[PDB]
Structure formats: C-alpha cells, structure tokens
Design an enzyme around this catalytic site. Structure first.
Site, mmCIF file in Angstrom:
data_model
loop_
_atom_site.group_PDB
_atom_site.id
_atom_site.type_symbol
_atom_site.label_atom_id
_atom_site.label_comp_id
_atom_site.label_asym_id
_atom_site.label_seq_id
_atom_site.Cartn_x
_atom_site.Cartn_y
_atom_site.Cartn_z
ATOM 1 N N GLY A 1 10.733 12.894 -3.473
ATOM 2 C CA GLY A 1 11.498 11.944 -2.430
ATOM 3 C C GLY A 1 11.853 10.794 -3.040
ATOM 4 N N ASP B 1 2.720 -6.038 -1.206
ATOM 5 C CA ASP B 1 3.208 -4.749 -0.329
ATOM 6 C C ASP B 1 2.013 -3.858 0.250
ATOM 7 O OD1 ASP B 1 5.738 -3.706 1.027
ATOM 8 O OD2 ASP B 1 5.968 -2.381 -0.814
#
Ligand SMILES: CC(C)(C)c1ccc(-c2coc3ccc(-c4cn[nH]c4)nc23)cc1
Length: 355
Positions: A26, A144
C-alpha cells in the site's frame, strides 16, 4: 508521478544486498511500502520507498538519522521497528525494515471495531510506554504516535507484540518552536492545538488517545478540525485552564475573552459563530460522548460475568481510567511520564494480587 511506478518482480539493489518485491503493501503520505525477499537468504523485509520530491528525502534523512541514532544493541527491547540500511533506487530514497503484519487500526477493523479487553490493551501499553521511555532518555519526540504507527509483528505467533514505526516526523527537544503544526489531529495534544511550548509530553497524549481508542474500539476525539478537536476535549474534560489559554498563540482561533484580561473569562466560540468567521462547518464525528472521563468506567460492560470475575473487571477499569486521566492531563507539566505509567497499578497489576 511523485510515486515510483511499482514493477511486477522489481530488483531493488543496495550496495550490500539485492531485494526482490513479492507484494505491494500500500501507499501512504510518505510513499509506498513493499514486501521483499532478501536474495540468497530466507528473510523477508518491508522497504519504505519515499516520494521523488526533495522534502521527503530529508524526512527519510531525518528518520534515517534518528534510526541511525537508535541503531544500537536492540530496538527489540524498547519495541521500535528494526531499521537495517538506507539506499537510493531511481531518484528514490528506500529504507529496509523488519517485516511487520498489522497496525492497530487494521487489527481493530478486522475485529469489527469491538472493544479490546483491558488484559490485551495492557501489553500494548507496556510496549508503547517502554518505547516512549527510551525516546525521552534520548530527548526525542516521535510526534506522529497513532494506531497506524503501532504495528503487530505477527498477531498469530506473537500475540500483542508491537513495534512503533515511522520516525519521519521525529525531533530533538532542543528544537521545538511554539505553534509548529504536529501530530495526527485525533492524537494531537492541547499544547499543539493552542500553540503552547511543547516536548516529548505530546506523545503521552497520543498514547492516552490510542489506549482509549482500544478500550472503545473507536477514536475518543475524532475532530474534523482543530476547533472541533478542542471543543470535544473541552466538553469532556472542561475548558483548558486560563493560564494555558492566555499563553497559547492559537487560542483566539477557537476561544473568546468574554472579559478583558487580567483574570479573563475564556469561552469557546459557539460552533455557529466559528463557522461564520472561518468557512469551516462543525461536525459531530464521535460514537461516544462523555460528560467526564470517569463515565468511561461503565460503557460496554460485559452483561455475562458472575461474582469475582466482575469485581476484577471493575477494579481493572478503575485502574485504567485512573491512568488514562493522568495521560490526558491538559497541562503537560502535570502529565504522567512513561516511567510513571510503567509503575502504575494498571500496568503492574498490583491491584489484582488478591482475587
Ligand atoms: C499501507 C500502509 C501505508 C498503512 C502501510 C504502512 C506500513 C507498512 C509496513 C509493513 O512493515 C513495515 C515495517 C516498517 C515500516 C515503517 C514505516 N515507517 N518506518 C518504518 N512500515 C511497515 C505497510 C503498509
């Protein structure tokens, strides 16, 4: 375009090794991740291919350097992804990693977004907290931390064993300018929303958000916008203290002084008013709405539990929501540290030694 065109059996050649691609896994914001065989061995690696644009290269450089700095005896003991080597392939920065199977979002989706029992949250929390403790010790901010950046190595063979990934956005404490735009919105600490000074403490907010998500099987604070994000928090946890609001560079984006400072009466902009003056519509995006975090104790309680085994659950939830409040403390100065979390009853299970 900016994304390298994947090739059916591509040979990705570094200086010390050569790699065959088996599976496109992906594409994300950084680029795409591809599963590869390391030719002349029996090992399979994930390779992060960053976008052609120079910016990403620094991001990889940043990540590279931090992984370089985090290259040591063991990533395994501090539960962050093992990086091996970085190399260029057709105007493309490529990073080789240990293969990892499933991030916490994918896992949850596979489980039909049904809440994770506390006894399986615990190990995850332990690992992520451990990671955070290492990071602090190096004066590093991940910046993050989110479900998609926590990955189960192999859920079947190694249940609930996780690695923190993606140090692309990571940063030393000595370099932390106020009102920098950091973090996934859902996992973004108030000090970033409001534009206050910040440090590794922001990651602890993200961690809290993650564990609440796991508990609920849905995000706690899924704001479409910083305005919504701060509105939601405010509903559940009260408005942030005056001293926080008064200091924030971004406060007046979201809040009004209803009385002049000093001792200002801060109020959240009404959604309507906010919309009027921004062109951003307020949404309701959340599956659970809580008057306070304590009320989390009582949701999705199993109605099939007898005697001691319900008492245990009650105890466990109490410990959980106690750690969670410490984690989701709006003032970073008062917010629980990784080490403290590691020595909290919910992790150490001291609260269960008599059942
Ligand atoms: C499809 C998408 C973008 C959600 C994804 C992300 C990571 C991976 C992945 C699979 O094994 C990995 C090993 C390391 C990393 C990684 C990302 N940064 N730094 C390391 N990422 C991975 C696979 C798919």
């Amino acid at each position: 375009s900016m994304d390298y065109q994947l090739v059916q059996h591509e040979v990705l050649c570094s200086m010390t090794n050569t790699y065959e691609v088996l599976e496109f896994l992906g594409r994300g914001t950084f680029g795409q991740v591809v599963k590869c065989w390391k030719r002349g061995t029996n090992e399979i690696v994930a390779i992060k291919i960053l976008k052609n644009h120079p910016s990403y290269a620094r991001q990889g450089q940043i990540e590279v350097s931090i992984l370089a700095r985090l290259s040591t005896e063991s990533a395994d003991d501090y539960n962050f992804v093992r990086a091996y080597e970085c190399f260029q392939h057709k105007n493309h920065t490529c990073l080789v990693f240990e293969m990892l199977e499933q991030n916490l979002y994918d896992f949850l989706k596979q489980n039909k977004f049904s809440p994770l029992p506390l006894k399986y949250i615990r190990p995850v929390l332990q690992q992520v907290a451990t990671a955070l403790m290492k990071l602090k010790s190096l004066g590093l901010i991940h910046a993050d931390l989110k479900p998609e950046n926590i990955m189960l190595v192999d859920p079947s063979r190694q249940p609930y064993r996780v690695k923190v990934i993606d140090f692309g956005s990571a940063s030393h404490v000595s370099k932390a300018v106020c009102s920098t735009y950091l973090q996934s919105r859902y996992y973004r600490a108030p000090e970033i929303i409001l534009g206050l000074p910040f440090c590794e403490a922001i990651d602890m907010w993200s961690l809290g958000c993650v564990i609440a998500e796991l508990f609920l099987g849905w995000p706690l604070y899924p704001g479409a916008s910083e305005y919504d994000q701060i509105r939601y928090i405010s509903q559940t946890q009260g408005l942030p203290a005056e001293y926080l609001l008064s200091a924030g560079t971004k406060t007046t984006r979201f809040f009004n002084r209803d009385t002049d400072s000093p001792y200002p009466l801060w109020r959240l902009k009404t959604p309507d008013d906010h919309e009027a003056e921004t062109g951003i519509k307020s949404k309701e995006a959340r599956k659970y709405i809580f008057n306070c975090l304590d009320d989390m104790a009582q949701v999705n309680m199993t109605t099939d539990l007898e005697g001691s085994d319900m008492l245990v659950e009650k105890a466990d939830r109490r410990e959980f929501i106690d750690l969670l409040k410490k984690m989701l403390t709006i003032d970073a100065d008062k917010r629980i540290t990784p080490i403290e979390t590691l020595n909290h009853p919910f992790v150490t299970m001291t609260h269960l030694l008599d059942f």
